Design a protein around this nucleic acid. Structure first.
Lengths: 201, 103, 35, 128, 180, 147, 185
RNA sequence: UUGGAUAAGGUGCCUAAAUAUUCGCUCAUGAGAUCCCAUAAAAGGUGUUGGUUCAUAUGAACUAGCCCUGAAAAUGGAUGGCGCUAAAGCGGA
RNA sequence: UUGUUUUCACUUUCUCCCCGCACUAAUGUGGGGAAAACUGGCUUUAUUUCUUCAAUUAUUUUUUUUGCUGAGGA
C-alpha cells in the first residue's frame, strides 16, 4: 500500500481473491509485481476450469477473429487479464492502475532476493475446504496450450538450490551475529543493560 | 538523520462518492497504520497537508501546499474524510498527504 | 424488603404451580387420546 | 375508539407508541415548535419563551411549558389547546437507521410500521 | 458484555381476561407464557394464538396487570423442552425440541437459525408451544447425550479469526493451521 | 494388574499430534472480540462451538459464553468440583497460583514484552535507542577486533 | 452424528511400523510400506510395545466417515497382503481358439494372441512387483500374486479388459479372461 | 448552497461501504446468485438433516430442504463483467 | 366437579473396591457396588474496597476528543 513496490509470490493463491486484492492495490496506487503465477490455484475441478476455458476459447468475433478477445495462454497473462477485468481499464486512471502491474512466470532476475509477500486472504489453506476440489493454473494453461510448464519447473528447482545455498550462508551469519551480541551485552554499562533486558532487546 | 518528519503518511483515495455520483467537498484519505474506525477516530481534527510540485516557480518556489483537516471517519476500515480549503484536484488521486501532529 | 420479596416469590411460585398443573393436564389429555 | 379506528386504516404508513415523560419533555424542549401567529396565519415559531404560550393560553391558565408537559403526559381537560397549538414535529432520520419500512414491527422478520407500544421512546430519542 | 453474540429476548408476564359482558357477567380468566423478540411482539403472538385457539381479540380482550417475572438465576445451566410445529411449501409437520443454554430467552431462539438453514422455514411458519423442563437421560437425540458425559475432549482445528487490528493484508510468510 | 515403566515412558514418547485438552479447569485468553485480553477458566462445554469460559475475581471477568472460533486456551488446570461457584473459584485460583506458572513461556514472554513496550514513554524510548547505539558501538568495535 | 471416529486396527506380530504425519512407513517380510493418503483428513495414534494402530477422524460425520472405514480395513489388509501374498483365481477362457500366450521378459510385457482369430498383437502390462504367471496345475489358470493388496488387485483388475471382441452376443459367446476366488500363499 | 443523518438498496473488485460476526445447507463433466425481470413442467431421487408412523439399537414406508436427470438453435456471450466454493451461492440471525 | 395433599428418582467427585483386569480419548475406560458431600443448596451473624454489585427499563447528572456554521447590528 505504502511501499515503493510489492512483490507477491502467487504460489497457492486463489485466482479471484488474489486478483481482487491486487486490483484494489493498483487502484489505490501501489505498484505490484506478481511472480510464480503458474502456481496459482483455482477452486473447482481441473476439468471444470478446462471446460470454462474451452468455452472462453470458442468465443471470438465472427467477422474477423483478429479483433476477437485475445485469449492468452500463459498463466501470468491469465492473472493479468483477470486483474484487468477487475478495474476500469477503459478510463485513464484505470489504465494507469493496470499498467502499474507486472506479472511473471517463475522468478525472473530482479526478484531473487527482494522479499516475496503473501496475502493470507487468498490462501488455499485458509479459503478452501480441504475435502473439496481445486485446480492448478499452470496445469490448466498447459492443457489449453502453453507448452512451457516444464521449463518453468526446471528454472524453479535451479532457483530453489541457488537460494538454499545463500540461505545456508545467511543462517550462519545470523547465528554468529547473535553470539557476538551475547558477549557485547556484558560490555555495556549496567543501567543500559537493564533497559535492553526489560524491553527484550 | 536530517529532515525530520513527525507526521503520518496518507494516500488520497477517491472523493466522498457513491456509485456514479461524487461529492468533491470531502476527499477520502487512507492512513499508513490505521485499519479500524476506533483508532481512525484518533486522527480527527488534525491538520492535513497536500504538498505537490509545480512545473515553474510561483513565489520563487516550485512547491505548493493546499491545507485541510480530517472531519470524521469513513467506514470501519481506517479511512477518513478530509475537507480542504479548496477541492482536491482529481489528478491527485493516489498521491501522498501529510497527517500532521498539530493540533 | 424481605416481606416484599417473599410476596413476589409467592406470586411467582403460584405461577409456576399453575404452569406445572397445566403441563400435567396437557399430558393427561394427550395420553388419554393417544390410544 | 374513534381516532384509534381512523389510525388503524393508516397503520401501514406510520409507527406509533407510548411517549413517556422524559421523551415528551425532550420533544417539547428541543423540537417543540408553536403556532404563535394569528388564526390561519400561524407562522411556526420555536418556543424559546413562555410569552406566546401565555398569550394563547394564559386566560385559560395553562400558561408555561411546565404546564404544557404537565398536561400532555396526563391527558387532562385541555388537549385541544395543546396538541393543536403545537406545530407538527419535524424529526431527523434515525441515527442508527430503520430496520425495514416495508414490513411491520410485529412480524418475526425485521420491520418498522405498526404499534411499537413502549419501544418508540428509543426511536424518538434516536430520531431527535 | 458482548452485544454481537447476544440475542434480544427478556422475560415478561402480563395478565388480563376477556371483557365481562352482559351475556358473560363473570368470565373466566386465562394466561399463557411465551417469549419473542419484544414484549409487544410476544403480546401480538399471544393474541394471534388466542384468536386461533379460542374466539377473542383486542376487540373482546383486555389486560389488567403487567410484570416482569424474570428467572431464578439467569446464570444457571438447564435442559428444557418445547414442542415445534411448522409448515413447508406443501404441507405441515410437527415434532418436539430440547436444547441447552443458560436461560429460556436464548433457549427459545437457538432453533430458528437451524430451521431456516435446513428446511428454509421462515420464522412466520414455525410455532413453539408448552415450554417445560426436560431430563438429561431421557433424551433420544444423538448429540445431546455426550453433552453431560463424565469426561470428554476433542481438538480445536478451527481456522483462526483475528481482529481487524491484526488482519494485516500482506504477510511476511504463509501461516500454519495448528496453533496452540 | 499394572505395568509402570513402559506406559510412563510412552505417555511422554507418544508425541500425539494434538494437545491442550479441553477438560474443565483450563485457562483461556480470548483471541477475537471485545474480550481479547482477559484471563478466564473453561468451566464446561455446552456444544461444538459455544463453550463456557469464566474468570477469577483476582483477574476480574464475569460469566461469559464464547464460540470456539475465537479461543486460545492455556495449559494450566485445577481440580475443582463440577458445581464449584465463585466462593470456591477465588480459593482454588490462589491455591496453586494459576497465573504464576504461565507467564514464563515464549508466547507469554513475547506478550509481556509487547505490553511493556507499547506503553513506553518517550524517555524510555530514547533510552532504548541510546542503549542500542552503544551496543552497536561495541558490536563494530569487537567485530573489527575479531579480524 | 458425533465428534470422534476411530478404528483400533490390530497389528499382527510379524510387522513393525512408524507413523509420521499421515505418512506411515512400515516393514514386514517381503518389503516395506509407505502410502500417500494426503487427500483425506486423518490422524493416527501408534504404539509398538503393545502394538495396535488407532486411525482416527475428528468431528466424524457420515459424509466422509465412510472413508476412514475404507482406509482402516485397507490398512489392516495391506498388513495382511505384505505378510502373506494374496492370490486371486484368474482363468483364461476360449470357446474356439485356445488362448495363445507369449510371456516375454519375465512377467513384464505379456502378449496375447489366439482370441477369436485376429492373429495380431495385444500386450497389457501391470504394476511392477506383482506376478501374474501360469499355474502349472492347469494351463488355463494363472496364479496372480504380489506384494500388497492394491498391488495385486489392480493387476487382477486391468487384465480382464484387454482383449474384448465386437459384434458377438456375450449372453451366448461367454468369451473372457475371468477371475473367480481369493486365497493366500 | 453548507454540514448531519437516513430511505430504497447495497458493503470481494469494477463501486462508496464488511473478504464483518454467528448458525446451518450445497459440488453442479452446462451449480447458484435482488419484486416487475427477462421461461421451465409432469417423472425420477437408501446424498444431508430433522421428522412421522409402525413391526423386536433392529427394517420399512413416506415426508421436504439443497443438488442432479428431464433441459436442443442457429454472428461469439453474458448472475451486469471479472470472478466466487473455510462463497463473493442458498435460508436465517 | 377445582383445589389440596402424598410416593420415587435426580446430583458432585482427582473418592474407593472388584471383574474385562489396561479393554482408557486421560493421570482410565465398559459393567456391578461401597464413600462423603473437599460439589451443591438451605438460616443466620459485622462488613461489600478481600470479592460481585450484572442486564434491561424508568428518572437524573456529567465527561474525553473534534467537524460545520456566525444570519443580525435594535
Amino acid at each position: 500500500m505504502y511501499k515503493k513496490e510489492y512483490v507477491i509470490d502467487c504460489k497457492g493463491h486463489l485466482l479471484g481473491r488474489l486478483a481482487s486484492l491486487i486490483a484494489k492495490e493498483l487502484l489505490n496506487g501501489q505498484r505490484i509485481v506478481a511472480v510464480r503465477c503458474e502456481d496459482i490455484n483455482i477452486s473447482g475441478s481441473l476439468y471444470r476450469n478446462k471446460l470454462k476455458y474451452q468455452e472462453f476459447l470458442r468465443l471470438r468475433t465472427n467477422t474477423n477473429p483478429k479483433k476477437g478477445p485475445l485469449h492468452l495462454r500463459e498463466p501470468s497473462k491469465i492473472l493479468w487479464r483477470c486483474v484487468r477485468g477487475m478495474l476500469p481499464h477503459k478510463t485513464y486512471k484505470g489504465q494507469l492502475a493496470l499498467k502499474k502491474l507486472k506479472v511473471c512466470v517463475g522468478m525472473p532476475y530482479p526478484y531473487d532476493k527482494k522479499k516475496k509477500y503473501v496475502l493470507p486472504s487468498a490462501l488455499r489453506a485458509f479459503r478452501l475446504k480441504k475435502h473439496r476440489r481445486y485446480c492448478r493454473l499452470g496445469t490448466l494453461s498447459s492443457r489449453v496450450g502453453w507448452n512451457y510448464d516444464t521449463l518453468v519447473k526446471k528454472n524453479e528447482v535451479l532457483r530453489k538450490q541457488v537460494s538454499k545455498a545463500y540461505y545456508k550462508k545467511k543462517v550462519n551469519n545470523l547465528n554468529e551475529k547473535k553470539e557476538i551480541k551475547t558477549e557485547a551485552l556484558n560490555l555495556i554499562n549496567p543501567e543500559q543493560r537493564q533497559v535492553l533486558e526489560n524491553f527484550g532487546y | 538523520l536530517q529532515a525530520v518528519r513527525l507526521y503520518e503518511k496518507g494516500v488520497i483515495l477517491g472523493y466522498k462518492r457513491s456509485q456514479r455520483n461524487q461529492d468533491p467537498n470531502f476527499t477520502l484519505i487512507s492512513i499508513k497504520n490505521v485499519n479500524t474506525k476506533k483508532h481512525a477516530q484518533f486522527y480527527v481534527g488534525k491538520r492535513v497537508a497536500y504538498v505537490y510540485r509545480t512545473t515553474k516557480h510561483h513565489d520563487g518556489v516550485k512547491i505548493k501546499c493546499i491545507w485541510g483537516k480530517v472531519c470524521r471517519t469513513h467506514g470501519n476500515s481506517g479511512v477518513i474524510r478530509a475537507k480542504f480549503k479548496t477541492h482536491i484536484p482529481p489528478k491527485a488521486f493516489g498521491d501522498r498527504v501529510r497527517i500532521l501532529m498539530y493540533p | 424488603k424481605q416481606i416484599q420479596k417473599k410476596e413476589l416469590q409467592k406470586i411467582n411460585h403460584d405461577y409456576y404451580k399453575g404452569v406445572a398443573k397445566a403441563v400435567k393436564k396437557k399430558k393427561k389429555r394427550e395420553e388419554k387420546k393417544a390410544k | 375508539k374513534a381516532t384509534k379506528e381512523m389510525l388503524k386504516i393508516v397503520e401501514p404508513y406510520v409507527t406509533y407508541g407510548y411517549p413517556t415523560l422524559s421523551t415528551v419533555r425532550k420533544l417539547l424542549y428541543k423540537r417543540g415548535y408553536v403556532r404563535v401567529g394569528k388564526v390561519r396565519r400561524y407562522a411556526r415559531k420555536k418556543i424559546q419563551d413562555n410569552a406566546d404560550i401565555s398569550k394563547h393560553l394564559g386566560k385559560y391558565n395553562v400558561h408555561g411549558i411546565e404546564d404544557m408537559v404537565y398536561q400532555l403526559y396526563t391527558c387532562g381537560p385541555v388537549f385541544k389547546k395543546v396538541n393543536n397549538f403545537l406545530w407538527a414535529f419535524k424529526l431527523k432520520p434515525p441515527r442508527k437507521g430503520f430496520k425495514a419500512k416495508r414490513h411491520a414491527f410485529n412480524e418475526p422478520r425485521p420491520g418498522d410500521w405498526g404499534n411499537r407500544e413502549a419501544h418508540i421512546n428509543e426511536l424518538i430519542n434516536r430520531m431527535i | 458484555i458482548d452485544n454481537s453474540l447476544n440475542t434480544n429476548i427478556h422475560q415478561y408476564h402480563i395478565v388480563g381476561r376477556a371483557i365481562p359482558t352482559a351475556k358473560d357477567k363473570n368470565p373466566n380468566v386465562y394466561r399463557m407464557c411465551i417469549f419473542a423478540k419484544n414484549d409487544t411482539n410476544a403480546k401480538s403472538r399471544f393474541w394471534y394464538f388466542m384468536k386461533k385457539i379460542n374466539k377473542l381479540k383486542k376487540s373482546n380482550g383486555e389486560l389488567l396487570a403487567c410484570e416482569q417475572i424474570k428467572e431464578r438465576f439467569p446464570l444457571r445451566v438447564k435442559n428444557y423442552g418445547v414442542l415445534l410445529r411448522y409448515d413447508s411449501r406443501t404441507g405441515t409437520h410437527n415434532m418436539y425440541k430440547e436444547f441447552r443454554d443458560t436461560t429460556k430467552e436464548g433457549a427459545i431462539a437457538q432453533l430458528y437459525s437451524e430451521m431456516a438453514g435446513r428446511h428454509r422455514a421462515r420464522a412466520s411458519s414455525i410455532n413453539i408451544i408448552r415450554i417445560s423442563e426436560i431430563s438429561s437421560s431421557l433424551v433420544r437425540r444423538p448429540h445431546i447425550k455426550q453433552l453431560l458425559k463424565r469426561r470428554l475432549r476433542f481438538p480445536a482445528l478451527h481456522l483462526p479469526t483475528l481482529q481487524k487490528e491484526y488482519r494485516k493484508k500482506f504477510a511476511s510468510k504463509r501461516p500454519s493451521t495448528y496453533r496452540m | 494388574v499394572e505395568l509402570t515403566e513402559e506406559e510412563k515412558l510412552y505417555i511422554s514418547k507418544k508425541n500425539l499430534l494434538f494437545k491442550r485438552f479441553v477438560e474443565p479447569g483450563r485457562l483461556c485468553l480470548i483471541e477475537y472480540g471485545p474480550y481479547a485480553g482477559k484471563l478466564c477458566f473453561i468451566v464446561d462445554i455446552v456444544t461444538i462451538t459455544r463453550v463456557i469460559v469464566d474468570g477469577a475475581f483476582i483477574t476480574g471477568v464475569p460469566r461469559m459464553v464464547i464460540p470456539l472460533k475465537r479461543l486460545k486456551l492455556l495449559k494450566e488446570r485445577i481440580k475443582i468440583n463440577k458445581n464449584c461457584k465463585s466462593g470456591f473459584l477465588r480459593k482454588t485460583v490462589n491455591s496453586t497460583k494459576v497465573l504464576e506458572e504461565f507467564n514464563n513461556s515464549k508466547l507469554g514472554k513475547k506478550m509481556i514484552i509487547k505490553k511493556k513496550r507499547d506503553e513506553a514513554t518517550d524517555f524510555e524510548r530514547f533510552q532504548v535507542y541510546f542503549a542500542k547505539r552503544e551496543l552497536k558501538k561495541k558490536m563494530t568495535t569487537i567485530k573489527n577486533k575479531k579480524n | 452424528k458425533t465428534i470422534v471416529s476411530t478404528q483400533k486396527v490390530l497389528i499382527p506380530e510379524g510387522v513393525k511400523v512408524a507413523i509420521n504425519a499421515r505418512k506411515v512407513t512400515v516393514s514386514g517380510k517381503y518389503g516395506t510400506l509407505r502410502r500417500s493418503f494426503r487427500h483425506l483428513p486423518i490422524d493416527i495414534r501408534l504404539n509398538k510395545l503393545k502394538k495396535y494402530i488407532k486411525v482416527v477422524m475428528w468431528f466424524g460425520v457420515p459424509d466422509s466417515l465412510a472413508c476412514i472405514r475404507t482406509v482402516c480395513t485397507h490398512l489392516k489388509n495391506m498388513f495382511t497382503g505384505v505378510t502373506k501374498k494374496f492370490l486371486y483365481k484368474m482363468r483364461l477362457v476360449h470357446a474356439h481358439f485356445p488362448i495363445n500366450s507369449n510371456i516375454v521378459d519375465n512377467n513384464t510385457r505379456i502378449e496375447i494372441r489366439n482370441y477369436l482369430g485376429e492373429k495380431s498383437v495385444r500386450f497389457v502390462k501391470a504394476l511392477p512387483g506383482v506376478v501374474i504367471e501360469k499355474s502349472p496345475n492347469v494351463k488355463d489358470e494363472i496364479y496372480v500374486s504380489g506384494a500388497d493388496i492394491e498391488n495385486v488387485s489392480l493387476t487382477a483388475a486391468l487384465i480382464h479388459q484387454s482383449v474384448l471382441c465386437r459384434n458377438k452376443d456375450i449372453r451366448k459367446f461367454l468369451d473372457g479372461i475371468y477371475v473367480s476366488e481369493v486365497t493366500t500363499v
